[PDB]
Amino acid sequence: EAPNQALLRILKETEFKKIKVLSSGAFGTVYKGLWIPEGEKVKIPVAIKELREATSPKANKEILDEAYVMASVDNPHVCRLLGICLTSTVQLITQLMPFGCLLDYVREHKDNIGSQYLLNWCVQIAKGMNYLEDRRLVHRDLAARNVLVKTPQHVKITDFGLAKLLGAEEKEYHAEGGKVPIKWMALESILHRIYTHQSDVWSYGVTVWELMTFGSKPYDGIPASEISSILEKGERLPQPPICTIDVYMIMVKCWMIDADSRPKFRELIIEFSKMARDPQRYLVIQGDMDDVVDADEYLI
Numbered sequence: 001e002a003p004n005q006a007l008l009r010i011l012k013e014t015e016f017k018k019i020k021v022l023s024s025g026a027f028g029t030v031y032k033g034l035w036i037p038e039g040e041k042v043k044i045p046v047a048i049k050e051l052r053e054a055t056s057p058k059a060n061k062e063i064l065d066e067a068y069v070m071a072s073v074d075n076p077h078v079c080r081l082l083g084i085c086l087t088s089t090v091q092l093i094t095q096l097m098p099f100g101c102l103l104d105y106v107r108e109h110k111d112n113i114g115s116q117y118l119l120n121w122c123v124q125i126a127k128g129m130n131y132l133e134d135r136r137l138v139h140r141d142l143a144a145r146n147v148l149v150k151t152p153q154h155v156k157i158t159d160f161g162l163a164k165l166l167g168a169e170e171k172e173y174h175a176e177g178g179k180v181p182i183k184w185m186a187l188e189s190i191l192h193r194i195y196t197h198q199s200d201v202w203s204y205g206v207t208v209w210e211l212m213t214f215g216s217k218p219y220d221g222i223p224a225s226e227i228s229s230i231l232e233k234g235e236r237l238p239q240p241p242i243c244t245i246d247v248y249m250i251m252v253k254c255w256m257i258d259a260d261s262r263p264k265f266r267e268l269i270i271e272f273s274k275m276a277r278d279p280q281r282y283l284v285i286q287g288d289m290d291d292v293v294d295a296d297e298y299l300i
């Protein structure tokens with residue numbers, strides 16, 4: 001329907017100086033870096049992603065898909081794509097999220113994370129997702145590992161490696177085979193490989209649980225083959241200790257079998273917002289260079 005007029009920006013390799021690896025693995029490597037366009041007199045902290053070295057024409061098709069998706073989103077709670085670089089090895093340039101991945105941030109900081117933070121993150125992610133829903137986009141890989149931390153007060157949804165743009169009002173996405181995170185998935189997904197905005201809500205549910213348990217592993221133990229039967233059984237994840245029944249009851253709703261019974265992201269924004277006005281009522285926690293510009297201030 002609506003034409004996608006997003007701009008894809010092609011950047012010169014000599015406009016950005018790498019600085020250090022921040023993570024390599026199966027997927028590839030990610031660099032901390034600076035982007036210093038033309039004469040513009042700005043330096044922009046960036047992360048440079050290079051889907052390994054291996055230039056198999058499979059690895060460039062995928063990174064180009066991510067870039068497609070990331071170029072089509074503009075929201076405070078969704079990660080910023082700056083452009084791509086067309087070297088032999090094709091590089092994704094995104095905004096640096098210095099504090100890293102939110103899952104590691106909760107593990108690394110429990111003893112210092114208060115309810116105000118937990119509830120604010122929940123609101124911010126719900127905003128990111130509500131906005132993806134507006135852009136008729138289905139994330140399919142929402143999990144705490146895929147949300148990054150720009151500042152502890154500001155998180156952004158990332159990893160669009162599995163995301164799909166729903167074509168002409170095509171209610172649900174029918175997927176191929178291939179590796180898929182089972183423990184974060186709606187049931188109608190694990191069984192029929194259907195993916196809906198409502199199935200994203202489910203993973204929102206597990207994402208919140210990962211936050212409230214400070215980074216625990218969903219169904220730690222249970223191998224992935226059981227997960228479907230276990231959920232048909234009516235079993236769900238346990239109420240985290242810090243969690244009031246108010247909060248946990250919202251998790252549980254994300255995990256209903258009737259997809260349309262679960263809450264809409266716009267509703268999750270509201271509920272978590274109300275809770276964020278009085279955090280200690282809802283979560284019970286012991287103790288409770290010169291020309292640098294952030295990407296979020298660098299517009300064109």
Ligand SMILES: CN[C@@H]1C[C@H]2O[C@@](C)([C@@H]1OC)n1c3ccccc3c3c4c(c5c6c(n2c5c31)CCCC6)C(=O)N=C4
Nearest residue numbers: 022023030047094095096097098100101145146158159
């Ligand atoms: C566990 N999740 C990973 C940690 C990581 O590799 C991944 C693939 C994962 O996260 C989504 N990843 C991306 C994957 C797809 C698009 C963008 C990123 C990405 C970015 C950044 C990452 C950082 C770290 N990853 C960063 C980034 C590791 C910690 C330092 C910063 C960053 O600063 N801006 C973008």
